[PDB]
Amino acid sequence: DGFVEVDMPSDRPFKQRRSFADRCKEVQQIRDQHPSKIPVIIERYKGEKQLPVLDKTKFLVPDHVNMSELVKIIRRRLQLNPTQAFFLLVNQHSMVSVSTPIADIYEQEKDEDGFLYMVYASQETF
């Protein structure tokens, strides 16, 4: 009766994989090396199945760009058709115009650890 050791890649959100201390320390280091860049965590929405999971979830973007540039980055990384539509929600369930500067979104919506959390989902998911 040996243990059937099962092991598989964790699908848990970034907040559950990295501790609060590690996340705070990481933003602190990043903002000290790159004071004009925003640390953004972009993950797949919890109820999304139509869109795949991206290999990368941590993004370091210039603080002079708008939400639009962030959509362009994710869209290309997802390799979407023009027929494929998706939303980019700040924190959770929160939607802003793509013309909105990310620096404005950051200072208003950033988590306590310093990261700005976003999720992507299909428009049909909601």
Author numbering: -6 to 119
What does the paper say about this structure?
Interestingly, these searches identified four putative LIR motifs that are located between residues 4–7 (4FPVI7), 59–62 (59FYNV62), 238–241 (238WIPV241) and 261–264 (261FVEV264) in the NSs sequence. In humans, the six LC3-family proteins (LC3A, LC3B, LC3C, GABARAP, GABARAPL1 and GABARAPL2) are key autophagy factors that function by regulating growth of autophagic membranes, recognition of autophagic cargoes, and fusion of autophagic membranes with lysosomes.
However, crystals were obtained by fusing NSs4 to the N-terminus of either GABARAP or LC3A, a method commonly used to examine the structures of LIR motifs with LC3-family protein. In both complexes, the predominant interactions at the binding interfaces involve the side chains of F261 and V264 of NSs4, which are the residues located in the first and fourth position of the core LIR motif.
